[PDB]
Write a protein that binds this ligand. Structure first.
Ligand SMILES: Cn1cc(C2=C(c3cn(CCCSC(=N)N)c4ccccc34)C(=O)NC2=O)c2ccccc21
Length: 306
């Protein structure tokens, strides 16, 4: 009744027996490597976690990530296919996503308008809305974690990396700690105030701003000054690039980039916003070449730093 009760969570050799390990894709605690299941042949991405070292707190964080990934089955979230416990290592086996970052694919297009921005943000908000409904907060929405499923026509945007995700109690806010990425951090996390689901919508507003113009609404080289701007919601819509952006897109950005999280738009309401919801009649169809060029520089900057 050990293996009968624990089942797929019981210690085993399921990974070593049923999969072959191939190259490293990334690294950070853990490594993500491509792998191929033998029995019915298919490609996956195994996150590999060395468990010999781990503290009680790190086990809880690993179990949390595993649980959260198991729970989330949505076309715009990268699916966990298995969670395998072996003697010294744990393996989270995910779908392999081969289309690369969303932001990289955008700069490679012939045409790119608001209507394409809205289409991306529609998919991104569907994933955020899904996780919020399941009382999960991602806490680290950013370009690096918005991937395309495949290089194929019509590939979905997929949310990745729930390494920082938290489970919340319905709509209750608490101090869950200082986590996230500088440029996308919410005022409430910087204030050290209680928080929850709204923090992910703040991040979506920053992403949405970048999808429209190709540069971030908040930046300073001095991180103390960056954080002051974010707390003050010190962004704007400079001309000339913002002059051709529809007032509807601007409206959605303002609602997402609202300092007080209680007043900030929800994912569910953002999905009912006309620019998202009635994209076809509301979103502009004019190509935004200046956005593609800024995005190129935005991607290069990030690549040059990493
Ligand atoms: C090309 N590719 C696909 C994936 C990937 C992938 C993940 C992509 N990320 C985000 C990591 C964002 S690179 C960063 N700067 N941080 C993950 C974090 C934790 C577990 C898995 C993944 C996933 O779920 N399926 C996949 O195919 C991946 C993961 C790490 C590095 C490259 C990579």
């Amino acid at each position: 009744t050990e293996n009968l009760y624990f089942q797929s969570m019981a210690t085993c050799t399921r990974f070593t027996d049923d999969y072959q390990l191939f190259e490293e894709l990334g690294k950070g605690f853990s490594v993500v490597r491509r792998c191929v299941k033998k029995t019915p042949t298919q490609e996956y991405a195994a996150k590999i976690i060395n468990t010999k070292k781990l503290s009680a707190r790190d086990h809880q964080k690993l179990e949390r990530e595993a649980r959260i990934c198991r729970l989330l089955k949505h076309p715009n979230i990268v699916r966990l296919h298995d969670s395998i416990s072996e003697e010294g290592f744990h393996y989270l086996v995910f779908d392999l996503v081969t289309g690369g970052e969303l932001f990289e694919d955008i700069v490679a297009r012939e045409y790119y308008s608001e209507a394409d921005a809205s289409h991306c943000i529609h998919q991104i908000l569907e994933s955020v809305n899904h996780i919020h409904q399941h009382d999960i907060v991602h806490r680290d929405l950013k370009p690096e974690n918005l991937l395309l499923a495949s290089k194929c026509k019509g590939a979905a945007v997929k949310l990745a990396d729930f390494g920082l995700a938290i489970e919340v109690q319905g709509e209750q806010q608490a101090w869950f700690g200082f986590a996230g990425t500088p440029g996308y951090l919410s005022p409430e996390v910087l204030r050290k105030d209680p928080y929850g689901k709204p923090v992910d919508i703040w991040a979506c507003g920053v992403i949405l701003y970048i999808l429209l113009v190709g540069y971030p609404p908040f930046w300073d080289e001095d991180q103390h000054k960056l954080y002051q701007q974010i707390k003050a919601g010190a962004y704007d819509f400079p001309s000339p690039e913002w002059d051709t952006v529809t007032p509807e897109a601007k409206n959605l950005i303002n609602q997402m980039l609202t300092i007080n999280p209680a007043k900030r738009i929800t994912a569910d309401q953002a999905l009912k916003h006309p620019w998202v919801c009635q994209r076809s009649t509301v979103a502009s169809m004019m190509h935004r070449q200046e956005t593609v060029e800024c995005l190129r520089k935005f991607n290069a900057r990030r690549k040059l730093k990493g």
